[PDB]
Amino acid sequence: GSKVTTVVATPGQGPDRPQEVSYTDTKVIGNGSFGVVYQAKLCDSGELVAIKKVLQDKRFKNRELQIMRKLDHCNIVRLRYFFYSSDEVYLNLVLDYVPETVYRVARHYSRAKQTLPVIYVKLYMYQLFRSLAYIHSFGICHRDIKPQNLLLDPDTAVLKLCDFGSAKQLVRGEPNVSYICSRYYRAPELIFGATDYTSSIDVWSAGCVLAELLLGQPIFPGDSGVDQLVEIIKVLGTPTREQIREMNPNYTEFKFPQIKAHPWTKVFRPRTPPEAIALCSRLLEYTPTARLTPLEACAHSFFDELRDPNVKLPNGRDTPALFNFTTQELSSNPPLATILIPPHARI
Amino acid sequence: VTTVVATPGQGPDRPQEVSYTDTKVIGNGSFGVVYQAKLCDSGELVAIKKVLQDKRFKNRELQIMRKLDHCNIVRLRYFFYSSGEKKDEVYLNLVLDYVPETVYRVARHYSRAKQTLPVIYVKLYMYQLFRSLAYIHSFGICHRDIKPQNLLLDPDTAVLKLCDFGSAKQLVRGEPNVSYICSRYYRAPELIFGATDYTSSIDVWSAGCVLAELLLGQPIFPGDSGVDQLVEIIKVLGTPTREQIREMNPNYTEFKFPQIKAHPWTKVFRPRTPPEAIALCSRLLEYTPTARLTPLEACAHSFFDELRDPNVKLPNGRDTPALFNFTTQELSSNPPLATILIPPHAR
Ligand SMILES: Cc1c[nH]c(-c2cnc(NCCNc3ccc(C#N)cn3)nc2-c2ccc(Cl)cc2Cl)n1
Ligand SMILES: Cc1c[nH]c(-c2cnc(NCCNc3ccc(C#N)cn3)nc2-c2ccc(Cl)cc2Cl)n1
Ligand SMILES: [Mg+2]
Ligand SMILES: [Mg+2]
Secondary structure (H helix, E strand, O other): OOOEEEEEEEEOOOOOOOEEEEEEEEEEEEEEOOEEEEEEEEOOOOOEEEEEEEEOOOOOOOOHHHHHHHOOOOOEOOEEEEEEEOOOOEEEEEEEOOOEEHHHHHHHHHHOOOOOOHHHHHHHHHHHHHHHHHHHHOOEEOOOOOHHHEEEOOOOOOEEEOOOOOOEEOOOOOOOOOOOOOHHHOOHHHHOOOOOOOOHHHHHHHHHHHHHHHHOOOOOOOOOHHHHHHHHHHHHOOOOHHHHHHHOHHHOOOOOOOOOOOOHHHOOOOOOOHHHHHHHHHHOOOOHHHOOOHHHHHOOHHHHHHHOOOOOOOOOOOOOOOOOOOHHHHOOOHHHHHHHOOHHHOO | OEEEEEEEOOOOOOOEEEEEEEEEEEEEEOOEEEEEEEEOOOOOEEEEEEEEEEOOOOOOHHHHHHOOOOOOEOOEEEEEEEEOOOOOEEEEEEEEEOOOEEHHHHHHHHHHOOOOOOHHHHHHHHHHHHHHHHHHHHOOEEOOOOOHHHEEEOOOOOOEEEOOOOOOEEOOOOOOOOOOOOOHHHOOHHHHOOOOOOOOHHHHHHHHHHHHHHHHOOOOOOOOOOHHHHHHHHHHHOOOOHHHHHHHOHHHHHOOOOOOOOOOHHHHOOOOOOHHHHHHHHHHOOOOOOOOOOHHHHHOOHHHHOOOOOOOOOOOOOOOOOOOOOOHHHHHOOHHHHHHHOOOOOO
């Protein structure tokens, strides 16, 4: 016996039928914007879990819970239970624990002046791209894709997207706030104030992450709000008439300095695989509608290695789930199935 | 000892030799790097701000730094240019008065000791700040980065001086400008909303935030993320009205805000907080750009009247710093107020 907390918590799936859930071994993981996350152990199953404790304010719409219950995908963190706690009201999401973040694993390689082996980039990025495909097919936008919100198991190579405190259904016509993502991963439309944006802000953030896994540092590290547009334009180059028109037409007579775009191949370190570069170029676009959809990205030639039936993880294990698509996932573009699920993986 | 070739800030536009010594770093940031040195010539302590600039971009810091002379603004003594690594870039070395402390440092000191700053010094510091804004807004210029980190001050004489003109730029009616601009705690709401047509009213908002934070003992609008800014504001100002929204940005006209009722101003600060100060913030931290006072209007306010009292003295028994020596320029904003701002006491 040790200190066991017992609470009455409602399943994440299912209809509001609470049950008693005991857990033990509570440790704090971290602390921030997201609230507080504890690690704990389910007494029942022995399994490890993250408990995310958000302070909530009834005055405001707090759509995290609604969305967490809505969804179920191997590349997204699972809500097991949730429950309420006591100065005011606290939401307690009980989620899948996962041992590491991309941020940290990347930071490790960075501190070792070592490039993360591409096979992991391909694994990690692919899986992110499925998690978006999925949330986006409900027209939900995460609006905080960054490395800290990408969890991974290093041994199993499984990635899981997390933190839906800023996620939200985006509806055509409705305007929404444009101070959203983290700075480095904030897409340029949002920096221009645009309220007419789409899902494809998350594809920009994804490209920023890919780039960062190939460089071993962030591709656009703005010193300050303003440096961010600088550090972007220094590589993307100055935008067309119609790129500005396509991000936010208020800037149509802004007069940016004229910078020639730094071609992609000279952005990346010299032994970098083309298809990495190629993909990267089709995510980090000014015109948002020019950026790949998440499913188009999964089908890119940069992930071909993963559809090889012989492929394995470096530690000798099998690759995780990569081809167990549902019709939800493929709604955006169902014929891609033929490329996405290779024959050996087909039922 | 190092000796470089450099150019007097005020005049004349002509290189001369300048020897300084005992360099030591003071800190790094978006601002570049600052060092302390002593001029070998006249013995003096000096701040050497060294930024890296990309010659393809309008780097308007030095022109602005040259057309300023004012007691509550850092004096630019000399400037020079060291060479950069890439051919597109270069080092600008502003050489300014060394002021020995900063407001961010002195509030974070008085707030470690779990208490408020002597209300005299809130009075003194905001006055001298609001003064320099008056001076610079008069030439069209907007600082665009008003925060306690950028307010140097001498603790003995209480002389405060505005600094870092890296984001500073002359606004000009009709032109569009980049919304994503100030430091985050102090970003005026219209900017959060994406307004490309903001005025120098933003710097007043920002000064409003600093007023708060000296009387609150810590920041008044601390977003733990970008989205939480507009939240932590609405939590104090309550929901904006269709008129207030329309004043900030036409596009959020249709945006479904939470209906939140304002938090009474006396109820925001400590119960023993002077109500003149409270009236002041009420008028500085208004959603609507125009409804915010000007800096000149702010200097001439009940809260600062204590400074005009002939019998006022610094609680270290010293005389005050030179609060009343206004120019014609400083007053252009609205010269009637000279009736209030300069008392009988001087003249
Ligand atoms: C200050 C700080 C900020 N970020 C972290 C941090 C550090 N290490 C790890 N390791 C993975 C631990 N397992 C976890 C963690 C969270 C979830 C879930 N939902 C599932 N599993 N995770 C995080 C982390 C990552 C995302 C969030 Cl929303 C919160 C945290 Cl604390 N610390
Ligand atoms: C990391 C960090 C961030 N801010 C600081 C910091 C700490 N201590 C002090 N003390 C005042 C020293 N004298 C000075 C300093 C600067 C100037 C001028 N222009 C004139 N005089 N100043 C700063 C500071 C404040 C504004 C700027 Cl732009 C730069 C710095 Cl380093 N350190
Ligand atoms: Mg930079
Ligand atoms: Mg908060």
